[PDB]
Amino acid sequence: KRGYDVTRNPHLNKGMAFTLEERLQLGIHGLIPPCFLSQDVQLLRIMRYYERQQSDLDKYIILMTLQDRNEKLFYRVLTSDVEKFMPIVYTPTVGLACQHYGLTFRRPRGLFITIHDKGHLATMLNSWPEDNIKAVVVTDGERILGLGDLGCYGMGIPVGKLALYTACGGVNPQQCLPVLLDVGTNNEELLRDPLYIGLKHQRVHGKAYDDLLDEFMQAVTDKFGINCLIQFEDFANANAFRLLNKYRNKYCMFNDDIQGTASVAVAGILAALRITKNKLSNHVFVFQGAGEAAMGIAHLLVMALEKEGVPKAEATRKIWMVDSKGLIVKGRSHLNHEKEMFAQDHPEVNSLEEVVRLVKPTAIIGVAAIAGAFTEQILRDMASFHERPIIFALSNPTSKAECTAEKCYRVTEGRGIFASGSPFKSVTLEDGKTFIPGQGNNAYVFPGVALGVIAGGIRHIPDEIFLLTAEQIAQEVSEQHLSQGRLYPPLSTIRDVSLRIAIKVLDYAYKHNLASYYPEPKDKEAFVRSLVYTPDYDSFTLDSYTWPKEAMNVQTVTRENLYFQ
Amino acid sequence: KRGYDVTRNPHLNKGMAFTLEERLQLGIHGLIPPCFLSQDVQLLRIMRYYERQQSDLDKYIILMTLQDRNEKLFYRVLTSDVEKFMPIVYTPTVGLACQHYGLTFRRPRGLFITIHDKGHLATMLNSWPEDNIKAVVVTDGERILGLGDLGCYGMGIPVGKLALYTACGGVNPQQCLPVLLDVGTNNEELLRDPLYIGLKHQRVHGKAYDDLLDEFMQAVTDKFGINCLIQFEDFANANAFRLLNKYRNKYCMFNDDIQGTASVAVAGILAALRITKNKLSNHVFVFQGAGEAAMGIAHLLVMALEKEGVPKAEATRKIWMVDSKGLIVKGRSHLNHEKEMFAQDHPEVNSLEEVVRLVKPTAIIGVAAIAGAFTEQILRDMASFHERPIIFALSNPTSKAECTAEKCYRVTEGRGIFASGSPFKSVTLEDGKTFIPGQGNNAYVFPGVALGVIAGGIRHIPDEIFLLTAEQIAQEVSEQHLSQGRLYPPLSTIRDVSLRIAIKVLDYAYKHNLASYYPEPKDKEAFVRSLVYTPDYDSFTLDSYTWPKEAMNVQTVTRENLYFQ
């Protein structure tokens, strides 16, 4: 692109980083002030306004304005300190900002598709100006993590998720498309909000809903190819599982709430085995919660146990799950298809405390967002049953965590192995023992998986890919980090971690004949590195060249040399 | 335009005001949330965020973001209460905001042309994407009214001035181009500012400067036509006069600081004559100040006196001017070409107070921005010399006014006729007398003059046009307003006032054979009204039609009817 429109193109606009020579060649000289900045200086300038904002919501606003106008500089900001900006452009800030301010994007970021557009989704996809789309993140806004039904304001979530695709993994942002499917909302505050801009009716459900999703998957792959990655985000429990099972073997599709959480949780368990120094087959798991994340984790745990030689039915019996009605047991009321798979042969048990005492688990995993569910008695019981009990308080936000890191370490007398979904600072007990608890962040998983899937044209994503990703993450943890109680690698290394995951995923796919891209690269690291997006500005070179002087003389015909021999 | 780019086009983008039918016809359905708002509702929504801003600077910022994305809605805001938003998008806020924040435009608003681009201005004009430009506002940022040398940050001033062209007069904003000429800056704070984005050297001056201005006028009229209006804004004293005299008879050009201020000041004097009930020839004027505004006013006053039958040399002697060195008298030191024209045959006089006592003027006009120059003694002297003395404290801002309205009315015992450049609230004296002092706003003049000049292709703008504009403004004042002491019509009627001025200017031009547009319209009001820009959204109609059925049948040839007779 050239001319005035390049300044309005977020992928190409450099602002004052355009050199004079670049402005003249593009035909834009005069549109930009007479100063030529480096991107380092641009980062300096924008960070001054970023730090002046009084709240995380206002910092998200500033960043979205920057993404609107200069994508490269936006990712220079994000990659300058990914741990600092990840909670601003994504969870938990993105949902809070969209809940409060609505959609602040002043440049269209993706597609809003409604139930009333049924039968015309193919035409709507043609509104997006990029034809080479390789990854889609879609939501219906019904189950925004930690907030619930945000309806059409849920569009902020795929936009923020895709920013982590690029910032943490290096996925080309220009090949990425966020989509909000608006079928209504059951949030009464939104339905009665004069300023709400989504469909003001209750959510369409049943097969009419499923038909819209079917046409969406068909239209996206008709236009962008069957290889296009489609990641589902923040769907409700029942819908999430039905859609995953319906599409995962027909399309290039996964659900990060089910399968990404599974991979990062199992990665923490695998790293804890390096401390407990026992086999996975010796463990007994109690789950606090039975939703999308809990089922995904339990399913991936069973697969990990099978890898160690434990038969499936025997592996399943090592898993005990507690929902809001109590222990999930055979013949109990209020069960569904997924819950029946882990139903134990045991009488009803009402409380998690009693389940812990009856089962005596080696590991407890909470994802139910019930604050304080890991009571002092539970922590005491576990520390008495086993030398090094594993305590995973994975619920978000911090106010809904099953316990704090400090309570776990204090009550277990420094022997509990802890991980959380929320960031906890270092803990120093009274006797001097220091712990650095890790955070089970989904960003350890989906950037590298997406990068490898996109790089190789991986047709479908079996759960073995999420299991090998968990295994790669667990080995990123150094021996010194383990001695500090850290079960996850530093988030500051996420781009290197995602790159190594992408390579392992790509290698797995070629060996299983799942990759569509050919020829198979001999050097997979070099191949994937060549697709990693950098915040560095590109260069508009002209690729000028000449022919040899003798060639140009004989090929240039004039009246003087027309009859030369 | 159609497709995704219409959402990025400020002139065509309606945002959520696009109906579903419009989105489908433009091929943008899906890029916009599934709600269809009226412009009234859009105005409601944006005004909520506008009123939440804590300062005028922040309100200017919000408005510039809106102008960046939706020009029609921007002018709906401005025209909703023009008196409220004029001081935000223009003086005094625009200069303060640009001084503090720099240039906040995230969409290019015009052209930055530097002295180092000499010889290539024609190429730079091709960077602007609009080919049909009919009005240019240019500055070099040296004398921003009330602030001084803002260098390249002066670009905000032509951008804000053009907003008043459109909001107050109805000039088509798409045909308007703001230009900043950067020749350097002598503001030491800017030269040492790490964040300053203009040329970091002192101002180029002399003929090298004049050569750049010559090439600018040549390039603009070469590309857009010799009829293109070029308005000079916020140039320094000497440059402003030299450039006006050099270009006003060669191009379609005026300087609003010299000639616009002149017209609005004379309009106030003419309206005061309706109260003093005497002839202009009976007046004696003392000027506090001798810069651009003072000279423009004095020159237009002489022309008004000539119209009443007073010969020029005799008319000039009714004008006494005081600069910072004292009364301008023949043979005095520190005089220039303009000052010598009004030099009186009198010994040197140091102070304005003594000049008032020696001259006993009927009217005093201050534009020198010296606070309190109209002392209690001056006001007392004038009220003793004449029944209804005219007191024009025209300097900006309020803190630099020669006196307040209340001081004028109190000291003159309610007999002084007052106007100011700054807004003063109503004044009620102790004896019950109430006054509503008017503000001599330049926006009474340049919108209507520009609208008439553009509508008619008026080749040059003689000062008679500014004199007839003053006469039109003075007659807009109602008899009831005069009894309240108001010398100017309400600013809420500015669009109607500008329209009547444009018609009178257009009529003058055709009678003097100055208008280029032909044929001469018989109904000039209807003609000008047809060019007035409204904040109303336009409509993308398809203009579909059919031929008569018999025509379509005979003109449609098939194998079946090929040989019909």
Next chain:
Amino acid sequence: LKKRGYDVTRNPHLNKGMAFTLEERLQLGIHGLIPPCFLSQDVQLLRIMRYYERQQSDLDKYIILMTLQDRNEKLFYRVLTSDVEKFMPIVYTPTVGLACQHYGLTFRRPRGLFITIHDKGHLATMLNSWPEDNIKAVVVTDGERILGLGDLGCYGMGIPVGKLALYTACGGVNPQQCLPVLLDVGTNNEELLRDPLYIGLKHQRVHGKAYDDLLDEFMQAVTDKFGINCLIQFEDFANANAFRLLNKYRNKYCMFNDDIQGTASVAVAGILAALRITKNKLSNHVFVFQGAGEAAMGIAHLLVMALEKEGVPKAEATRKIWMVDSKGLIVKGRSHLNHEKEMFAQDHPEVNSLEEVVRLVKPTAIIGVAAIAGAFTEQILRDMASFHERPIIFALSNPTSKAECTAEKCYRVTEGRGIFASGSPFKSVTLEDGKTFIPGQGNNAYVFPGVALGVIAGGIRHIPDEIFLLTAEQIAQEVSEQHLSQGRLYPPLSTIRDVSLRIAIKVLDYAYKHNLASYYPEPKDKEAFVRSLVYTPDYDSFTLDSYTWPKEAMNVQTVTRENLY
């Protein structure tokens, strides 16, 4: 964005000329550019055909068709498919070469890419000159061996243009996805080198590593931009180069050479059809080849493959083949052999003439491809008719003037018992006794359109020789029993579209069976799949996808100042 405005009239894929309806002209914004008559495509065809039949020569008919293809692609293929047997010799062999030799390149719209040896290192940049991004088939030549004519240098661009016309007209391959390329490395044609009007490179042909490097870069650049699945067909290369490039690329790219592999498959198809007359097996036959070039090697290798399929050991199969080059019979120990010729060397004394080889070997089939006129002498034909009841006489050399013998001479000398086929079309033959024969033509168009259609439809990554053998078996079954009784070995060219479809399906079945097809999911109904991809001369629609939402839903989504609360 769908193409609109004046440019659609210059778009050969979309321009309909006067077949644009009034509704379409207004929708596209082109009304006024076209005369005021609305023609059906049938009437357009009638109009162009009257001008076509008025041309006095095949060369002039070619020029008329080329100016039509320049302006209206759909009407062009309406003409071609109205009688493909009539127009095939006009747009391709033999007319295309004679036309380009005489007139040069008459295209007035750019048809493809001229890439020269002097452009080495910049081929990726040159591909970006072609305005179509979605290319699925490339036909490339260096013009060295135009069939029947020799070295035409850069005038050889006509051959890929004409070849691709047959892809679409004969097979139904989408023409918009097709790209012809001329590689200019010079020419050894002395008439072109001394012609002041020649527009190619004016030097002898560059050979050696620089030539090979250019071809390597061409294959890399084409597949880098359009994908590794892009079909690349080599045409009219010199014999040594053609074989060497085929072996280098056929397992790395989706590539084949029609002069070698297409000729082999159609020749074997004729032999297999002759078996339905001789009513014996392929292993009962003994082949003598007049000519030992690479086209003869192509036929010989495919024959050995067909013999192995019958169960003949490879060594036994190869000994059924006797080849005669310019030096005589290829025997063991003979001088002037080469690597490929020694594979078919027989343990036999040296024999100088083809006539003596025929008498000593007594072949059941003789195949001439050496382009030696009259090589099948009366003695050879008389001997064949006395050795076997129904000898096979294949005079496949081109052009007609260099055929080994005419159809009349074969039928007369063999007393009506010889089974004849040629590469040139011979008319019907009636001997003096009344016996009538209809000799068939071994046209490469029986092969490459269906192969290309199936390869492109399935994303078949490489084209093994098994595909050309099964294509030959399909063609041999197409001939009716009645046509065999008349001496016809090939199906009527008027059925080529149906034959091509059946070949494409068989190729697709084979590819999915052996994991060669990259398109997924594998279609259950291969016939319906391919039919959906076949291009038709029917003009495409411009129906706008407009619709409304339910009335109540749209009312709730429509927000005004009145219904805001």
